[PDB]
């Protein structure tokens, strides 16, 4: 009965933790933010339609200069886009057709991709020759690569389908720190503005906060009730918004360590794929399976706009660093720039 | 850079992607003759993927195969214990939201091994499936030449049982094509080509809404 005693102790600990959350749970963000005026209806138009992808664009990523856009599609082609002029800066063929993630380095020299091949392939965009080649091949994950982000030029963090997250060094080619503790397939992670810590959402309906240097699970958030597919920090860095398959978007505060506000509507029965925050963080954009995106207010949990025009499920979306525009990529092989 | 993409566009559309999924004992590799395989029949390329490098959680990476031409389902009839498990797997694939527009080609792999099992009499289907006792061989069904009548009834009961889930849901968007395969068979590639050709023909008719 040793196992039974351990489970009872964990259950008691959860009740004590839950009581701790309720002790400081006085008032709500919705109650506090009732006095401020609503942002109002937001009108968004497709300034640029990026065409050329053969298959569905499962993942996309923005550049730090708010000009270069990288998108990964199942046709086996990785394309770097010039959003201002709608031109293909580069077209990188992929060894594996199935790619699920793509990352753009903050400096812009490196671009990464990963998918069902269980390998995070990284290409150098600033090579002397000018032709894109595999700069370094990362292997060691026993599950499909779902999300990868560039902490810097030499460090990359990847979330895989084997319920683990890893930190990889480009020069060494091996995982320096492995983040273990998730009980479900990790689908997405976000990087804090200071890159000191990051949170990864898995298919276990929980988001765990990790610190890159220490490699330990600082905090765990359990507010959702279905598979988590979208993770994004607030611009302040002290909070993050999480979208799941239960058609609800929930905002969590790192210091409060509890659920702040839920962005759900009765008519919505479609899960969340990608979420993002605007420059100020007041505007929340979430992807949906109903062939369109919805614009939410981070302080009032009301719908402010609808991003229609997509002929399939919105797989991914992203907002530029300066907040100039938001790009949405769906399964219709089309990328749309909204402003 | 646009010229290279145009050349790749023709190659991408010319080839047909297929997904090979099934039980480990079903003999997925036998159907063909790293995990990726390519076979060309009648001057058209057929490209098939067997995903075995992932875990048992298949509710997330299965969404990457919503654009394939068809799903090749391989099931073994020699094990009645795992036959129910395969039926649940087929039901999940058939009723999947992202796979509702993809036809499924069902292979009753290693039908030769099923012959000895039903003739021996040690293992009875009725123990696992009570409906087998009341089941009767359909008139439209054609018994295999040189085969016992019980062999035909046993193998068609499994095929019919798989087809009940197929007819239960789908609304005509996707169709199931059941085939019987022995231990060795060189007609597997031809059968896949015929069904894939049929799937494309029905897709255009549905697109024209004649179907």
């Amino acid at each position, epitope marked *: 009965s040793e196992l039974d005693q351990l489970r009872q102790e964990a259950e008691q600990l959860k009740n004590q933790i839950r009581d701790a959350r309720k002790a400081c749970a006085d008032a709500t963000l919705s109650q506090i933010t009732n006095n401020i005026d609503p942002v109002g209806r937001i009108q968004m138009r497709t300034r640029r339609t990026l065409r050329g992808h053969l298959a569905k664009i499962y993942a996309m990523h923005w550049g730090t200069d708010s000009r270069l856009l990288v998108s990964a599609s199942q046709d086996g082609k990785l394309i770097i886009w010039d959003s201002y002029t709608t031109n293909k800066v580069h077209a990188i063929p992929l060894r594996s057709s199935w790619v699920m993630t793509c990352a753009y380095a903050p400096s812009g020299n490196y671009v990464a991709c990963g998918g069902l091949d269980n390998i995070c392939s990284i290409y150098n965009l600033k090579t002397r020759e000018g032709n894109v080649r595999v700069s370094r091949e990362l292997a060691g994950h026993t599950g499909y690569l779902s999300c990868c982000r560039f902490l810097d030029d030499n460090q990359i963090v990847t979330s895989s389908g084997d319920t683990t997250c890893a930190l990889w060094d480009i020069e060494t080619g091996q995982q320096t720190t492995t983040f273990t503790g998730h009980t479900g397939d990790v689908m997405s992670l976000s990087l804090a503005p200071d890159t000191r810590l990051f949170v990864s959402g898995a298919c276990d309906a929980s988001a765990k906060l990790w610190d890159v240097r220490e490699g330990m699970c600082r905090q765990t958030f359990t*507010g959702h009730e279905s598979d988590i597919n979208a993770i994004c920090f607030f611009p302040n860095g002290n909070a993050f918004a999480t979208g799941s398959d*239960d058609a609800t978007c929930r905002l969590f505060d790192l210091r409060a360590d509890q659920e702040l506000m839920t962005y759900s509507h009765d008519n919505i029965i479609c899960g969340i794929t990608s979420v993002s925050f605007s420059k100020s963080g007041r505007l929340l954009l979430a992807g949906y399976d109903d062939f369109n995106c919805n614009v939410w207010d981070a302080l009032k949990a009301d719908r402010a706009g609808v991003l229609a025009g997509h002929d399939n499920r919105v797989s991914c979306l992203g907002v530029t660093d300066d907040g100039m525009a938001v790009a949405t990529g769906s399964w219709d092989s089309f990328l749309k720039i909204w402003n | 850079i646009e010229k290279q993409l145009q050349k790749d566009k023709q190659v991408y559309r010319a080839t047909h992607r297929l997904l090979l999924l099934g039980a480990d004992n079903s003999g997925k590799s036998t159907i063909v003759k790293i995990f990726e395989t390519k076979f060309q029949v009648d001057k058209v390329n057929f490209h098939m993927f067997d995903v075995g490098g992932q875990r048992d959680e298949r509710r997330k990476w299965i969404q990457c195969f919503n654009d394939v031409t068809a799903i090749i389902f391989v099931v073994d009839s020699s094990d009645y214990n795992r036959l129910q498990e395969a039926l649940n797997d087929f039901k999940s694939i058939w009723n999947n939201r992202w796979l509702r527009t993809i036809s499924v080609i069902l292979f009753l792999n290693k039908q030769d091994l099923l012959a000895e099992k039903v003739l021996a009499g040690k293992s009875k289907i009725e123990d*696992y499936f009570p409906e087998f006792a009341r089941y009767t061989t359909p008139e439209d069904a054609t018994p295999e030449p040189g085969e016992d009548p019980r062999v035909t009834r046993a193998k068609y009961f499994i095929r019919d049982e798989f087809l009940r889930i197929s007819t239960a849901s789908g609304d005509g968007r996707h169709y199931c094509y059941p085939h019987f395969t022995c231990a060795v068979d060189t007609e597997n590639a031809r059968r896949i080509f015929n069904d894939c050709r049929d799937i494309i023909q029905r897709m255009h008719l549905r697109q024209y809404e004649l179907l």
Partner: nanobody, 127 residues
């Protein structure tokens, strides 16, 4: 937090009656299709029966067809399974499982040892 608790179980004489109760918390019980799965000793997990969101679509596996009666109680977020005519083969650990995606009739609860939406379960022994 999603947590499923199973009550009942225990040793039962063959041919007896058992009513397992599954407690659901942290989610709306009415919005998810619910399943019961058992894991025989030395064997992998297998699906037993499922209930639709409104209970209209209920199906059972071939081994408990007619023998087992299942139902859901949306008033207090409870799932009930009735077992009759116990046999030695039925001796297994029964788990209460929930399909992940709401408003869907498809799920992959047959997954073994890696599923956050499956409860701890209860041990059922048939003499």
């Amino acid at each position: 937090q999603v947590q499923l608790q199973e009550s009942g179980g225990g040793l039962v004489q063959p041919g007896g009656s058992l009513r397992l109760s599954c407690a659901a918390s942290g989610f709306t019980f009415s919005n998810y299709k619910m399943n019961w799965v058992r894991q025989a000793p030395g064997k992998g997990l297998e699906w037993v029966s499922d209930i639709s969101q409104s209970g209209a679509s209920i199906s059972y596996t071939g081994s408990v067809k007619g023998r087992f009666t299942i139902s859901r109680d949306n008033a207090k977020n409870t799932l009930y399974l009735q077992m009759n005519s116990l046999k030695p083969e039925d001796t297994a650990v029964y788990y209460c499982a929930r399909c992940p995606a709401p408003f869907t009739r498809d799920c992959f609860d047959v997954t073994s040892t890696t599923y956050a939406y499956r409860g701890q379960g209860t041990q059922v022994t048939v003499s």
